[model samples]
Target: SFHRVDQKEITQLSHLGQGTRTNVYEGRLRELRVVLKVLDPSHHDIALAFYETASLMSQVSHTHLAFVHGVCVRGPENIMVTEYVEHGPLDVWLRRERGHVPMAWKMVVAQQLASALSYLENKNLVHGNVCGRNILLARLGLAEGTSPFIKLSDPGVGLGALSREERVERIPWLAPECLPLSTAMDKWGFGATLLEICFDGEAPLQSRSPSEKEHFYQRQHRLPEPSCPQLATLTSQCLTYEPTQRPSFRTILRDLTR
Candidate 1:
C-alpha cells in the first residue's frame, strides 16, 4: 500500500537539519522536489522505531499535511521522502520576520492545522508531533493574489521522541495527565504551538527547572497569559490539567473555523 523507491533515483541532496534521530535533507525524487529524512543510526532498535513512523505516515492523507512520496528502507537506506513546500518551517519564518505577516494569515494557518489534526483524530491516530518546527508554509497563487498553505511536515523524523533539553522544552506542551501516547496529548501540543504562533516564535513555557520530570512533577503550573492576550484564552482549554477535560480536535477545529 506504500510506495518504496530506489535510492538511485534520488539526487542533488542538500542538508536541511539534523534532529535527535534523523538527518533531514531537501532533494529531488527523480523530477519532483521533495524532503528526505534519513535515520541517524545512533543506537540499536532505532531502526524499528524509524520503520514504525513511516508505516504510520503512509496511512495519513490531508490537504494540510505533508504528502508522502515514497520510502527507501532498503538496508541502511532508511529514508522518508515527502512533498516539499516553499518558505520552510513556520518557526523559522516566525523568528525571521515576527509580526510581519497579517493576523489573518496566521489565523488561516491555525485553522488549516486544526483541520489536519481533526483528520488524524478521525483515523484514531495521534499526531504526537505538532510543533511549529514541524509545520511548513507554502504559497499558492490565485488570479490576483497569493494564498498560503500551512502544512504539517512528514513523520518518520522525530522517532524516539525522548531527548534531553529538547524534551525539557516540550514539558509545557505535555498535559498534566500525560501518558506515553494518546490523542489528548496532541491537543496539548496544539495549544502550545498556538502559543508559539501567537507569540511569534517565543518558547511556549519557560520554567526555571532544568529537567522535564521536575517541571511536570507537580503538574500544577500552567501557561501564563500571553502578550498576545487572545491566544491565552484559546489555549486554556487545551492546556487543561485533566486530559479528559481538553477539547477534542473536532471541537477545536469547529471553534477555529467559527
Candidate 2:
C-alpha cells in the first residue's frame, strides 16, 4: 500500500533516540534525508502493525502534519522513515526559546494543529497522542504572520506501540475517560499542549501522581488561568470534563483566527 524501501537502500547517519521497542536514527533514504524508526526484533509483531498503519498514514498530507515516507518489512528488522523535523519537539522549543516566542506564533500553532486534526477527522482518522513531545517544530520561509511550521506527528495507531512507562509520562494530558480515546480526548490533549506552551513548555500537572490526579479529577478541580488571554478561553473549552461538551476541531479552527 506504500513504498516498501529495502533495508540496504537506507544509509544510517546517527542515532536520534531510543524507546523500549524502537531505535531512531537520522539517515538518508537515497538523496532524501529522513528519520528512521527501527523496531526492535523482540516486537516484530508490533513492527507489522506499524508497517500497515504507517502505510495508510503516508497517504495523508496536511500543512501541519508530518509525512511518513515509507517502511521496510523485508527481514530481521522493520523500519519506518518520516520527514526529518529539524528543531525537534514543541515542548523543548518553547522552553529553549522562552520569552522569545511570540503570541502570534502560539496562535498560529494552535490554529494549524486544529486544522490538521480537523482534516484527519474529516478523513476518519484520529490523533490519539496530541502532546507537545509528539508535535514537531520546523523552520522555513513563509509569511510569518500567517503560518508557523509545526507538524502534528504520530496519530492513533502509533500510540499503541509505546510501552506503559512511556505512555505513563503523558498521564497529565489524558482526559477523564481517555482510554479508547475518541476525538474528544484529542481536544483535551490539545488544551494540555496549549497550557504547556503558555507555561513555557512545562507539562500540565506534572507534579501530581496517578492517584493524586484521580483524586483531583474526582474533585473536578480545574486548571488556573493561563497568561495568554487569547488561549485561556479555548483551553478551558478543551479541558471540559464532559467529552460531549467539548467543541469539535472544526469549531476550534473556525474560532481560532476569527
Candidate 3:
C-alpha cells in the first residue's frame, strides 16, 4: 500500500528538529537530500497519524505541497521521507532577511499557500497547522532573485497528534470559537501567517505568550492590522469572529492572485 524504504538506503546527515509527535532528520535518500520524519515509538496515536499523513501525501501531488519521496515502515520505526527544501521554513526566511524580502515576493508566497489550502479544502481536508513554521520556501532560483515559491509541510491530523504545549501555543492563530480544533480554524491560521510575512516574522502578540489576555483577544477578534491595505483587509476577513463569515480558501486564494 506504501512505498517501502530500506534502512541501508538512507545516509543520516544531521538532526533537523523534533516535535512532540516526531523527530526530523536531514538525510540522503537514494543520493537525494531529503527530510526524514520518524514517528515516536512510544505514542501509538502519533504513529497512526504519521501513517495517515503519509497516505494523504501519496494520494495528492501539488507544486505548493512538499513532495514525499517514500516511507520507511519496514523496521521498528516508521519514517517519512520528503524533499529537502534548502531555504527551510518560511518563518526563518522572513526573519533572516527581514525587510530585504520584497512585498511582491511575500504576495507570491501567500498566493501559493492559499492555492495549496484551497486544493486541500476541495479534497475535504484542512491543514490544521498553517503557520509559517510549517511552510517552506523553494530553493530554486534563490540566488537569482526569483519570486517566492512555497511548499507547505505538516498538515496536522488531530489534537491527539499534537502535544498539549503545542495546542496551547497555537492559540493565537486559532479562530474565536475554535478552542483547539475546527475545520475552519485553518483559515484563521492562514491569515495569521500572512501577518507574520507582512510583519517580517513577528507573530501576532509576539511579546506575549499564550495566556488569558491573549485568549481574550483572540475571542474578541482582535489583531494588529498590517500596513498594506489589501493584506489588512484579507487578514481582517479571515479573522472574523464567526467561522461562517470567514472566507473559504478558494476565495482567499482568488483575492491573493488579484
TM-score of every candidate relative to the true structure? 0.87, 0.86, 0.88
Instruction: Give the Å error, residue 45, model 2.
Output: 4.8
Model 2: ten consecutive residues of lowest lDDT: 139-148
Report clash pairs, candidate 1: none
Better of 1 and 2 by lDDT: 2
TM-score of candidate 2 against the unseen true structure? 0.86
Rank all candidate structures by their TM-score, best first, as comma-separated numbers.
3, 1, 2
- The sequence of per-residue lDDT tens digits that candidate 2 reaches over residues 11-123 is 88889777446788898887887888887775655665677668768888888888888887757767888888888888877887789777777777878888888988787
Q: Please give the distance, in angstroms, between residue 257's alpha carbon in candidate 1 and its true position after superposition.
A: 1.9
Q: State how far residue 179 of model 2 sits from its true place (Å).
A: 4.2
lDDT tens readout by residue for model 1, 171-198: 6655545433677778888888888888
Checking candidate 3 for backbone clashes, the offending pairs are none
CA lDDT, candidate 1, residue 7: 78
Q: Show model 1 residue runs off by greater than 4 Å.
A: 140-145, 157-166, 206-209, 216-219
lDDT of 3 by residue, 1-258 (tens): 457788888877788787546788899987788988876664677667777776767778788898877678756788888888888988877788877776777777888888888888888765677788889877533455566677998663445467556666776675556554456878888888888888888887767666764566545847789855579889999887788888888788878889
